[model samples]
Target: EPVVGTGASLSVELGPRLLTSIYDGIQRPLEVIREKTGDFIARGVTAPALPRDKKWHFIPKAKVGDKVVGGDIIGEVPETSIIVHKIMVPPGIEGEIVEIAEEGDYTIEEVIAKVKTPSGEIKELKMYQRWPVRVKRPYKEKLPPEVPLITGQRVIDTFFPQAKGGTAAIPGPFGSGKAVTQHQLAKWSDAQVVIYIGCGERGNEMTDVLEEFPKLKDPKTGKPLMERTVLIANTSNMPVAAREASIYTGITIAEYFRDMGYDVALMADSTSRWAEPAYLASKLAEFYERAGRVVTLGSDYRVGSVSVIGAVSPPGGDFSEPVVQNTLRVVKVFWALDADLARRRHFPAINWLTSYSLYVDAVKDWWHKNIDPEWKAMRDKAMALLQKESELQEIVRIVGPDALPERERAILLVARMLREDYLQQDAFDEVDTYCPPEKQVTMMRVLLNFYDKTMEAINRGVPLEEIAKLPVREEIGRMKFERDVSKIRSLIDKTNEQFEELFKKYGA
Candidate 1:
C-alpha cells in the first residue's frame, strides 16, 4: 500500500525504473517529472536572424501550442552569420508552447515562446538536474595511497602511479600526443568506469574513436573497450554551443557513474579549444576589455575531489598561453610533455622537473603498508640518481658519462638501470611488462643489493675494472641474481604470494 496525500499528489520511487504519477480531483493528464532547476537542457539555440539573409530557413516543427519532449527540435535557423551560425529552438519542458516569436526577427536571449508544464513535476525533476552534481569522494577513510595506476609506460608507473581518485592533467602543444595519451589512459588505466569527452577538436578525431573504440581490447579483461566506456563527443563541426556543452556533459555523466560508488576516470582531450569560443563569446558581448588574460599568479587552487584528467594544448608552443596557465590553476598533477622529447622517440617525453605529483607523501605510506618500508627510500634514491643523470646530461654534452668519476659513473649506471630496466617498456611486451610493486620490490632489492656490494668493493679500493668482471650485474640483468635457473622457477612460485600479500596489506 502507498501513502496518500491531499488534493493533487505527485510521487516518485527511486530504483532502476523510476516511477512518477499524479492524482487529481478531475484526473488531469499526468506529466513526467521535468527539471526546473540546477541545469538547463537546450537541444539547440536560435541565434538572432540577420538582415539580407534570404537563404536562411527556419524549421518550426512545433505550432503555437504543441507539446514537446526534451530532445524535440522546436525550430532552427538554417544558415546566417558565420559567427551567428544556426538558430535552434527547444522546448524548456514536456509542455505545450503557449506562444511563438516571429521566425525571422529575434534578439539575443529573447523569449520567442512560453511553455506551460505542471509546476510540481518540474520542481521534482529540477532536483535531479544534470549539471553541478555532487559526487562523493571515491576513497573511504583515507587509506595508504600506494598502488601504482600501472600504465604500461614504465616512467609514470614506477615514478608516479595515479591513485584511483587521483587527478592528473596532461597539457602540451597541438599534435603533442594529447589524444594518444588520453586514448592510452582510457584503454589501459585500471579505472572502473572510463569517460572520454572529445571536445571542439577535429570531427575526424571523434570519428576515429567511434571506429576504433570497439576494436580495442580492455587490457584487464581482453574485451572490447566500449564495454566499460562512454564517449561524449561534440566535434569541431558541431555548433560551438554544443561543443562547449560536451565537456560538462561528459563530466556530469562521469559524476553519475561516480555517485554509484564506482571509480570513474573522466578525461577531456583538450579544454583549451573549448575555452576559445567562450572567450570569443565574452568578447562579442562587449566584454573585450576583460578579454585579454593577465598572468595567473599561482595563488588560486580549487580542484574538485573527482579524478578529472584533462589536457590543455597551447595554440602554439607557448607555455605562457592563457588557457594553459588558467588550467594549471585547477590541476593537482601537471605532466608537461616536451615536443623535442617526442621527436626523440620518447613516448612520455615528460619534463620530469616540471611535472609533479603533490601526493608524494601518500605514495610513501602505500609503500610502507603494501610494500617494503624501504620502498620509498629506494624510489627517492632512484629519482635522485635520475636527476643527477639529467643534470650530468647538460655537462655530458661537452664531456661524457664514461669520463665521470667512478662513484658518479656508478650513479649514472643505476640511473640507466632504472630507465632501461624499470622505465622503458615495449607495447608488445606489455603482457609481461605490468610489473606490480611486488615485482618492483623483488627486482629493486636484488639490483640495489648487488649495487651495494659493487659500491662496497669500489669503496674498499678494489679496482673499478675488477667490479665489472663480477657476475652481479649479469645476474641482475637476467633477473636470476639470487639463484640458478631451477631456483628462479621457484621464485616465480612466490610472485603471486608477494602480489596478494602487498594488495591485502595496502588495501589496493
Candidate 2:
C-alpha cells in the first residue's frame, strides 16, 4: 500500500486540460472566480483550477485488462470549445485497468477508471489530477536545443539570437521599456504557445494585459492572440507568497504544453519582486533546465521546447544587484535595458553594448540553413562597427568631431546609421513593430554595404562631407520604417546605385 507518509513521489498529471482562459498563482481559474465574487480577483478566495460541477462527456480509450503506463492517454473529455482534455496515466504509475466507466457525462472529480497496480493495490484515476507546481514533468531523455527562437525583433534575431529552449533575462530600471519588450516578445515570438506571468508587477500593468490581449490577433494564425496564451497574474498587492509561486506556476503550464510537443515561450514580467527570498539562483536554474527536447515512451522522440524570458527590475539600473547578478549567472542571454536610452526616447532601449547572447553558436547553424549563409559574418561586422563607434565616441568627447580625420568621421556617420536605422525600432508603428528575418538580413546588408562603401570612398580621399551629403544616406535611415521587404530591397539597390555614381565622380 502507498501510505501517505511513505517515501513514494507524487504523480505529475500530464494533459491538455492544464490550461484555460486565465489562472492565478496556483492554477485557480480566474474566470470562474470572477463569476462568484463579481470582482476580477479577491484575496484569500480560491476556486477550482477546472470547473468542479460542469459535466464533461467522457469517452474511455482504454479497456479492462489493458496495460497502461504513465503519459498513456486513457480517456478524453470535451472540456472546452478549442481543446479536448486528454486524461493521461499519471507519471510513475503502470498497471492494468480493472474497470472503466461507460461513455457518459462526468465531472472532473469523478473516478473514470480503476487500475490494479503491480503491487496489487487499486489506483483510482480521475478526469483531473493535481501536481506540485515546482516539480518537472517526466520525460525519457533530454536532447540538445539548437534551433533559434525567432522573436521578429531585429536586435534579438539579427544580432543576439536566443535558442528555442534557452533562457534569457532582461534587467532594467523603472521606465526602461522592460515591460514593453516582454510584451512584444509574447505577442510576436514564433512560439506555438505563450505563457505570460505577471509576477509582482504594477496592478495596472496586469490589468492592461487582461483587457488588451483579447483583442490582438496572432499574425500567423489570424486568431485572437489569447487563444494560445496562458496568463498567470499576481500583482504587487497580492500576497508575497502567491507572487513567489506565480513564476513556477507559469513555467509548469509552459512545460505542459511543451510536453505536448509544442514550442512554448514563457515570460515573467518582473522577477525582482519574487527575488527577495533566497534560493533565487536555484529556482532560476531549475526552471531554465526544464526546456529542451525529450524522448517519450514507445521509442518516439518529441521536441519539448520551452523558451524562458524573465524581466529583472534592478534599482537605478544597477546590474550589481543580487537579483540581476544571480539571474545573469543562470540565463544564457541577457538584454540589458538602459535608462539613458529610454530617457532619450529610444523604444525597447536595450543597451547593445551590454546585452549579449551566449547561444549564438548554438543557433548560428539554424540561421545559416534557413535565413542566409552570410548571417553570422554580417552580424559580426555590425557588432564590430558598433564597438568601434563606442571607442570613437570617447575620442570625440575629449576632442570634438571636427578634430577627427575624414575616415574617422565616416565611421561615426555609419555607426549613426546603424543605430537610427538598424538598431532602434518603433513599437507603436504597426508595420515597423515586427521585423521578419528576410527584412532583417536585407536591412543589415544595406547598412553594412553603405559602411563599406563609405570607408572605401574615404580611403580614396573622397571628402567625408560629400559622402554625408549623399541623398541615399537618408534613404538608408528610412528603411527601418518600411514594412515591405521588396520595397526595402528596391531602396537598397537605389542607394547602391547612387553610391556607385558618386564613387565614379570622385575618381581616386
Candidate 3:
C-alpha cells in the first residue's frame, strides 16, 4: 500500500556493525577489504558491511505471539562495548512473530524471528535490514527541536545553540578551522549515534581520522568515541559522484538509529566539495531535509531525532559561492566561520556578529529548567554588550576611546572580558575543550556579574581607570580554562568585593 521501489536506489545494510565502523561512499568497509587483500584498494573488490560468519548475543524483547510492525524493536544486541543495538522490525512489514530465537549468539544472517504477514505469507527476519539510501524512512509525526544537541563548545551552547534535531551549516574559506570545529563537534556531541562524513576531502585529512578517532574517547561513556560513531569517507582520490552518494549512506544509517529511538548527530565536513554537478543543490536539500525530531514509525510511538551539522568551504573565502549560498538558506543555525578571526588565532573562528541560531526560542526553556532559570536573560545581556561594543568602536575610530562616555568605556572593557573569558575556547586543552551546560551557565553568570558590577561602578562616578585597574579582572579573564565550575561562582563574590572596595575608595 505504501510507495515502494527497489533496486535503482542504493540499499545499505542496517546492522550492529554500523557502529564503530568506517566505510567508503559506497558502503564498503575499507579496513576489512584492506585486511583481506593488502593495502591498495583494487577496483570492483567486494566486502560485506556486516560479518555473516560472526555472531552477536541477541536478547529477545518481543515474544513469539506478540504483534510487531515497522520500526518496532523486537530485540537488541550489545553491538559494541558501549552501545546496545536495537533490531527493529523493518518498515512495511506488519505481522505477528510466529517464531522467535532464544537469547543466544547468532550471526546477523541467521534468522532471529519469523513473522506471519497480513497476506498470510511468512517473513523471515534477521538481525540486519536493508534501507534504500535515497528514500526517507517514514515517521508518524515530525516534532520541533525543543532539546539542544549540547556540543560542549561554550560559544555554541551559550550563544548559537543547535536544537537536537536542528540543521546547521558552517561556511569558511581555507584554513579557517572548519575541519577542527567539526572535529570538536563530533567529539563532544551528546548523541547516541554519530555519523561523520568526510566528503571530497584529501586522503591525508581522512587518514587523520583513521589514526586519531580510535584513540579519542567519548566524554560521557568513558570509552572510545568510535563505539558510537559511523564514519563515511569519500576523499578527493575517490570519485566525486561517489562522494555525493556517501552522505546518503551516512544519513540512511542515522535514520535507522533514529527509528530505534536514539538521538543521532551527523557531521558532514566541507560539503562544498560534495559535487559541483547541476543537481548539487537538490542533493544538498534532499539530505538536510531528512533531519528532524520525530515520532517514529511503529505501532507504539517512540520519540527520536537526527541532527545534521554541515561544514561548507566556500572558494576564496567567498560566501557568494553557489554551494555556500544554496546551503546557507536551508540550515537554521548558521555558524559563519571567519578567516580574519582564524588569522588572529581564534580556534573556532565563528564570528559572533554574523552567526545565529533560530532555535533560541525552542531551546531556551530546556536551558532554564536544566541549567539556570535566568540563562536566557544572561545570554541576552552578554550579546547586547557585544553589539554595543561593536557600535562604540565605530565612534572610537573618529573620536578615540578617551573621548567616549564612561558607560561606553565600561561596555568596551566588559565586552572584551565576555569574549575572551566566556566565548573563546580551545579544542586541544583538556579542560577548555569541552564545557558542560551547567559550567557554561555558571561561567556566564560570573562574567555578567562583572559587567553588572562594573556598570554599577560606572554609574557611581568611579573613574573607569580605577575599575579597570582592579586585580579581580585578571582572574575573571582566565576562568575559561578552569575545570571546576563551582569555582566559577567565587568570581561573582570576588567581582562584588572588588567593586565594593572601589566603591569605598570613590565614596562621594
Candidate 4:
C-alpha cells in the first residue's frame, strides 16, 4: 500500500504527558525529498542597470532590508518586456542576511549579502544539492523501460520504437536535422517532462526553440507547449567546461523532476563535441599517452546519471570513429540515417541496414496488444521485402532486373510494391498513410493478394501494366473485412495493380 504525505508532514503518536513513536515517514524516511531540499538557500537580488536602449526594465518586490524565506516572491520583469524572468530563493534550508554589499549591476546569480543560518552557520545555502553523481537508487524499483515510446512519426512508431526512459543515440553529419528531430521527439514523446540540453549546438538553434516552442500547442492539452518543456542552453559560444557540464546539469534537473514521480525525457544535442574539450583538457596534462580520447571523465563511465537521449554529429558519415563508437557503448538504441538516402528525398532516410532498436520487441508488443495483432508480421515481411529489394538492386546494377531469373524478378517486383505501400509516406499535400498496426496488416494482406492475382495475370501474357490498372481500394473494400483494413488494403492493391502494368512496359 502506498501513502501520500505533504512536505515534512508525517503521522505522530502522542501520549498524555509527552510525545513518542512519531513516524518520520514524511521527513527523515523519504530520502528523495531530503536529498532535493537539504541544501536549499534563500537568495537576495538587487536590480541591475536597464539595457542602454531601454529594452528592459525590472519590477522589484522586496527592498534591501526585507527578510525572506525560500520561494518568497522577489520580483518579475515588466509585463511588456522581451525577456521574461523571475528571481527567487530556492526552497529548503533556513538563513538570514548578515551583510549588505554595494549593489547596482549584479548578475542574476550574484549574491547580494551573506546569509547566516539559525545555528550560527554561515554559508551559501542557495545552491540545490547538485544532483547526485548518480541518481539515488530506491526509485529503481519500477519496471525497466520496456513500453514503446511513440514519436507519432511513421518510421519511429511503426519500425523502431523507443521505450520510456530508454537511451538512444543519433549520429549524423552537421545540418542533418538533428536538432529538429530532438524537437520532434520533445513534442511527441509521451514522457511527462522533456528536458532539452543544448550543449555545443549553435545559438541559433536554441533561439529557434525559444522563439517557436511557446507558440506551439500541446498535442494532448491543446494548450501552450512550454508547460512541460525544460530548456538548458549552453551554446557553442559558451565556456567549454560549461558545455560539458550542461549534460549533467540537464540530467540533474531531470532527476529532480523524476523524483517527483514524473516520466522524464532528456535530449542532448551532439555530446561528442562536448567531449572534445575534456579530451583537450586531458591532452594538456603532462601525461602525453594518457591524452587519448576517453569515454567519460575519470575511469567509471557506466554511471547512470539520468535517462539521456543524445545525438552525435559524425565529422563525416563515418560511424566507426572513436566518438561514435564510444557513445554507442552506452546508449541502447542506435538510429543511423544515411546521407545518400536523404539526398534521394527519403524523409527519415534511416539506413535499414544500420539503424536498430534494442527495444524493437517492446514496440512489437505494443502494436500487438494495443494495435492490430497482424501488424508486426506484415511490417516484418515488408522490411524483409525491402532488404531483398536492396540486394536485388545491387545485383540488377550488374545484371538488370529485366534480365533476372523469374523468381528473382518476382521478388524484386514485390519488394518495389512494399516500398510504394509502406516506405514512401508523404509529409506534404496532407497525405498521411499512418494507421494502427491492425489496419496496417489488413492493408498489407490485401496488397499481397492483389500482387498474387496480378502476377498470375502477367504469367498468362496479360499486359502487366493493365493488370496493375485495377482500383486497389475498391477491391479490398469489396472484401469481407474490417473497414480500416479494407480501405487501406484496397488503396494499396489498386496502386500495385497499376504498377504491375507499368512494370510490364518500363520494368523490362
Give per-residue CA lDDT, model 3, range 369-426, as digits (tens): 9889998998898899899988988889998867988888889999888878877888
Question: What's the lDDT of the predicted structure labeled candidate 2?
Answer: 0.74
lDDT by residue (tens digit), candidate 2, 147-256: 88898888888777888888888864222234377667877888878887766646466666667667877766677777777878766555555555667767777766
Q: For residues 334-358, what per-residue lDDT tens digits would candidate 4 score against the true structure?
A: 7776667778866556666677777
Give Cα distance to truth, residue 502, candidate 1, Å: 34
How many clashing residue pairs are found in candidate 3? 0
Q: Tens-digit lDDT track for model 1 on 71-95? A: 3345544221111121222213456
After superposition of all CA atoms, the RMSD between model 2 and the true structure is 5.4
Residue 402, model 4, lDDT: 70
User: Could you tell which candidate, 2 or 4, scores higher by TM-score?
Assistant: 2
What ordering of candidates by TM-score runs from best to worst?
3, 2, 1, 4
Clashing pairs in 2: none
Query: After superposition, which runs of candidate 2 have C-alpha atoms over 4 Å from their true positions?
Result: 1-20, 31-46, 53-69, 72-89, 93-127, 172-179, 203-206, 275-280, 296-299
**Per-model C-alpha lDDT, please?**
0.48, 0.74, 0.82, 0.49
**Which should have the higher lDDT, number 1 or number 3?**
3
Query: If scored against the real structure, what TM-score would every candidate get?
Result: 0.60, 0.83, 0.92, 0.60
Order by lDDT, highest first? 3, 2, 4, 1
